[model samples]
Target: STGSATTTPIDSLDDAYITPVQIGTPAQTLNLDFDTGSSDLWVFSSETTASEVDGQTIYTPSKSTTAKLLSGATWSISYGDGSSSSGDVYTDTVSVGGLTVTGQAVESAKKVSSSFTEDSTIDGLLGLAFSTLNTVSPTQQKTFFDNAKASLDSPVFTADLGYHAPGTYNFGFIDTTAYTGSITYTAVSTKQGFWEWTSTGYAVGSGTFKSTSIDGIADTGTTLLYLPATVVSAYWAQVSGAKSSSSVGGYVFPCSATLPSFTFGVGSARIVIPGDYIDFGPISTGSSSCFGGIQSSAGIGINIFGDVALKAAFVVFNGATTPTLGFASK
Candidate 1:
């Protein structure tokens, strides 16, 4: 089956891409973050304590006749950003756009961190990463994509993210019309359960392109671009008013500054991000200071091509025997 769903930006944060998904027998629709960094179909649910849910919508399994508990199964997950969630498991039907998978593992949350509780708009997370990354106890769970791959025209999905606007996530089939120019394909290293790839090098502003291998993953759930500390420092040095601020938690700069372009090499093709995109947004409301979108990923042990970087191009995640990533100009 072929289906495509819209992913809209939440506020100006651009932290995650939310898409509509239907769960259970009668279909409880939830706006889920389609994340490529982790593997789990988890949602705020009846199992969660009332105090922990905040204003988020929750799924009521009892309302669906088809929901079944997976005896003794549990799941716990911690993100690189320190956000986490844990819950019990259920088997139910899940639908994305028009594609449906029966008996999909649905992790019903019993606990969620403040990061998720405060976000009232997101009801759950639909992980698009490899099934090997699933955190279900006893038996590993398969992602919706993995369960439905056999019925799809192609074992692939496309993420066309936008800046301060709506984009799309297409499954089973790729629409040639969504991108311009030929899609530049690159080999992916999935040993780490991520769409990890090595960039030939990068350049700041109009500077010369550096020739070095930079390893990173395409993480749509993350908000900003993360690079090696040395790489981040080099880019910040070019911004006259930019500095690392303890209060801001990363590099900050004056809002009035004209930033430079950041470019990354994808094999022979180059993906470029204009300076304005790197400015991110004001550190706080009505504040003159702004945070740099590209910052240090030293703590995470690997770089992340977050929304700040991914929004600049069209991405294709091919789930073949030899998984590959394709990038194209939007």
Candidate 2:
């Protein structure tokens, strides 16, 4: 699980998701929840003690024989979940899988609180998104990718998710053995750093949507797909007795029989999302209930097409390329 929800007609995903390359040695290797929403590689350090680094993996400067920290730099992240952490920035030779990218810029959080602090399952995160939402503030900030891009062989990094493979998050250059698909690309605006996309709308139950298309953003940071209100209600009418349920976050169904199936049309390919995902995600029980698969953003100016849309195809972010953005798999 890339820490997000997903659904599709994909029979085998050998192609599921990639096993992340554990950077550093096994003793001090940083556990990363690689996120494409933000560009940064943050890890817990031995210096932190207040909140409890008890069961967490911390990068100890003393443990590494070759890694170091970034001087005069610092980082602080505050999420919508109210979890927060602040710490000094550092530099080190990051070795993941069998690939080693030396002098990589990273942050060592001295103070951290949130899901990471609450749940000690993983260590920290290696944000693979874009530099746009990076933690680097105007005062003094730079992402690990930004710092290492020049030194990297191709500046472009990939996350190859496997299809039922135990651990397939291989960083560095994509292992061509990962999949078998031609790559499709859409050049992204240099300003938008994260792995972003433009949505054209959805196709449901083999029938074309009335709206046909809706422009939206694809975000890995966001856990669910959010749509517009009008779009939500209109979609539910297609389903039988699509009543709103309050029990769940508004997306559970009493009888999931024959739930509507949908797919998102991303430029070159169409990614299909199964009906079961919507039913299990939550059933629409609220009077203002929206479609489970497609949802309203509560008036947010932009809609986010999350896991449901991303799981269908292989996604690639090319920071090395002058303009940026590329999609392909192999």
Candidate 3:
């Protein structure tokens, strides 16, 4: 028989979302950031350096009879934002919502970056990326989804990330009621261990949809929309007070500026990101300048459809043979 689960997604600081998971024998609950940008299921643990442990909860492996250390197996990873973590591995029972998987490789963190150490609410990260990207030594590790897929009716998951509110992450099933209109799908390439796809073209505001190919990744962990420098410049040119500000970082404009809508292509489907979403709050609490959500991916050579763009629609991440992405209005 197949099984499935729907996790409650909690919107957190910086537009990030966290989901709850139970690990080990007695079932210790932990809040984990479900990241599609990386692979490796890691948690803050008693093995972590005392200095690195802030207000976050730590998993005590010794307390769980089912936890077994994978001797000599170590893992480490660094993010684009320069945050990093390294740890030893343990095999244990892991559960998300009500679905459970046995002998899951659970990375117990011994070291972590300040960005993670300071974030008290996030106890760990549940990576949803392909297992090929796992950073474990001696042998790579499969993700929670990868291990549970064999027991599922369908090898797929859906991400419904809401704007400044709670949403849901559905596993092994697609709930048609979660989205409106027809679901539009596009083929995905996983050569880089990411959900990479090509955008036919994009346009600023109500302008004509320019016919150009843009390669990008669907990253829930990332907070902003990253496009090519040319595309970013074109979008900013239409805003009267917008400019690249080193002090504020990226582009910034007056908070009161009348920004235009940004639209991207996915085959015949078009996803539009509203002007208000692009404003991205303010550079500071009382500052008149606000940061632009769409930035340039010039150095990286790849665009990122982060939360700002993702929250506008419901997304389906299909992991079956010949993977594809389905998007629909929420």
Candidate 4:
């Protein structure tokens, strides 16, 4: 399989979050956040506290003639970043790029931080990664994909995380063309839900991170892809307009020029992060600067190839195939 990995560092407040999304038809787009740590899909309402709606979308129930709330149950979720949201469940007839999934489940976050409430272009999250880590499921058994599977044109779902550019999170079913050959399956570890593996070594352009080799696992739960110190620094040096920044709490570069292509040589499989995705916005940090995407996750120890990396490729997490994660190109 062939693919690339990348990372996008997000800033947060106490319950800071953003719900800006560009889903729906060009004429009617919806801003949203696409999260995997939780199952149910939701949005904040105008009735919610203004603070939480600061950087997020405030879905006006009255505007959506098709929107409906699941009244029997209530929901709330807290992430490791110290962010949390809570509200009642709702379902409505929502559409994306002409694709409509009726009777869809959504949660309305009643309380949120100002940072999340103010994001103009972002909205609620679309958790298509996995359901095991979902907070809404007390039994931790179901997912949005699971519920939408029957209605989808296909059983498979895919994500095309376009870089600094724009790309919609594809829902409903999988595109067979995305996976060219026979599906390559990786066995999942039994202990936790993590997909672990060993890297042959690290490489940036034609060179390797160091004489030393690094090993880590791929996590869909995370937004940024993490690598060893040597590998991460090497990548920052390659891109043209790419320069590191302190705002995203990591590398922030301008998406003004075309970005250099690099590979995360994974054995027979090579992952690639498209130029648009690798190239990001600029951040001012004193004097010296670097490319965007790379960030610091000092608190989290595991080497994680987060969504920034996975979205560039066609990722399949088959619990039936074992907790293993499979990858292919778009």
Candidate 5:
């Protein structure tokens, strides 16, 4: 069936986003990050120790008669910070927006590092990427999207990542009214367990368009736009006050610097990210320097079209026979 869900910025910093999800038969609702960069529906749960929780909601399987233990199933995932979250498994009735699905695998977090506990806004993550990326052992597991697709009218979902306001996630079909002009479809390579694709090129403000291929993934879980050092340097150079600071760990510039808009090509389409988004935020409480929304992906090993880029356009995750992606300006 077709459905839509309202996703809101988790905090004022726009560091991440979350959508409410209902789990279990009795319905334990939690705010979860819809992470396209991953493929596991894990959550803070009854199995976790009291010390592991930090005022976040938890899913109790014993409260729901329909919830059943997955027996030998277990899962774990590591973050870029080297921290991790691991847990047992449970199958329960799940609901997103108005779409309902039974027997959806729900991972119960046994423990989470302080890195995750640092922010109580996220109860867990609802992985929308391909099931191949699932970290569950033994039998593996289907992603929330993977299991829900068969019940949906179309095997597709769309992302509308907002900047300072609330965003939306639509399932089953594309909402033409949610976007503008026309969507440009592109091939997606899921071999690496990501919604990976190659961008046509890029431009810094009104500068010459650099016709180069940049391979990356449209990751909703990531916070910033990361590109080749050359491209990042080019953009920062346009800002007189900008500088690459090793101490700060990235490029930082005057809080009120004149930032140039970034434009990237997708097929015959060009998506322009507003200059304001480039000014990530002040480096500190009242610091005059601001961190950048765009950074070099050299250390990351792979470029990423994260929330910073996704917020500029409408993105479609089409789980078709061949699996494709669609981008449209708004």
Candidate 6:
């Protein structure tokens, strides 16, 4: 079976992509972030403390006739940036777009970090990464994608994330019309629980392509493109007022400055990220200085081709036993 859903950016910065999901009987609908960096399908549920609950929708498992408690099962996950959520588990019927998965593990959040609570745009996260990264204890839970892969016409999903417009997430099959030209496929290493792959090199604007092998993860969860310091610096150098700011963190420049486009190689093809995408709004409201959407991965310990890069291409997350990633221009 094949199914697809529209993904929308919560804000102008394309901070995160959100998609609505139906869970359990009575079908409570909650908007969730589809993250390819983590593996845990957790939600803001009734169990979440009152103080932790903000303006987000709550998944009341007790309200769903099909919801069943997974007794003694619990899960917790944290990210490098310190955002996190934890909860107990349940099994229920769930659907995204038109794809349905019976007995899909649904984690009900008991605790959520301030970051999650403050952001009312998203109720929870739907992890699409490898299930091996699942945080559920005693019995690791299979991600929504993992559970539905077997029933899919093709064990694959595609991401066509747009810059300022609505994007799409398609399961089971790829829509050839979604992309232009031919797709370039490359091996993906899931051992690290990420869609990690290597790029042939990079080019700053119209500059010559640097033939360096850059390994990074294609993470939809991350907001920006994080490359090596040298690469990031090169891109900034092209902008007139750009400077590395310690206090502000990473690179910052005058909002009026003309930013350069960024390009990364995928096999013989090169995907270019428009310069405007790198100008991530302003540092503060009414501020003329803006933060860059591209930063150095030095501190993070891993380079990442996040939304800034992914939004520029049509990405195919192939779920074969030995997986591969496919990229094509749209």
Candidate 3 has an lDDT of 0.86
> What are the root-mean-square deviations of the candidates from the true structure over C-alphas?
1.1, 6.0, 1.8, 6.8, 1.0, 0.7
Relative to the true structure, candidate 6 reaches a TM of: 0.99
Once fitted onto the true fold, the runs of candidate 4 whose alpha carbons sit more than 4 angstroms away are 1-29, 55-57, 62-72, 80-82, 94-103, 137-141, 171-185, 188-201, 208-223, 233-261, 274-281, 285-288, 314-324
User: Compared with the true structure, what per-residue lDDT tens digits does model 2 show for residues 17-75?
Assistant: 22233444333555565556656677777777656676776777666666565656777
Ranking by TM-score: 6, 5, 1, 3, 2, 4
What clash pairs does model 5 have? none
What local distance difference test score does each model get? 0.90, 0.55, 0.86, 0.53, 0.90, 0.93
* Count of backbone clashes, every candidate in sequence: 0, 40, 0, 52, 0, 0
Listed in order, each prediction's TM-score against the native is: 0.97, 0.74, 0.95, 0.67, 0.98, 0.99
Q: What are the per-residue Cα lDDT tens digits for candidate 4 across 241-303?
A: 554445546665544555655566455566667545554344444434434554444556757
Q: Residue 96 in candidate 3 has what lDDT? A: 81
- Tens digits of lDDT, candidate 1, 1-330: 988889998777676678999999798999999999999999999999788887777899999999999999999999987999999999999989899899999999999999899999899899988999999999999998889888889999889998888999999998899888888999999999999998888999999999888999998888889999989999999988899998778999999899998998889888998887787778889999988999999878999998888888899999988999998887
Q: Model 6, 1-330: lDDT tens per residue? A: 878999999998899989999998899999999999999999999999989998999999999999999999999999867898898999999899999999999999999999999999999999999999999988999999999999999999999999899999999999999999999999999879999999999999999999999999999989999999999989999998899999998899999988889999998899999899888978999999999999999989999999999999999999998999999999
Give the number of the best model, judged by TM-score. Answer: 6
lDDT of 3 by residue, 147-258 (tens): 9888877888888887666778888888889999888899899999998888888999989989899889988888889999999999999999999987777999888898
Cα deviation of 53 in candidate 4 (Å)? 2.5
lDDT of 6 at 198: 96
Q: Model 2 — which ten-residue stretch has the worst lDDT? A: 1-10
Provide the lDDT at 276 for model 2.
52
Show where candidate 3 strays beyond 4 Å. Answer: 1-14
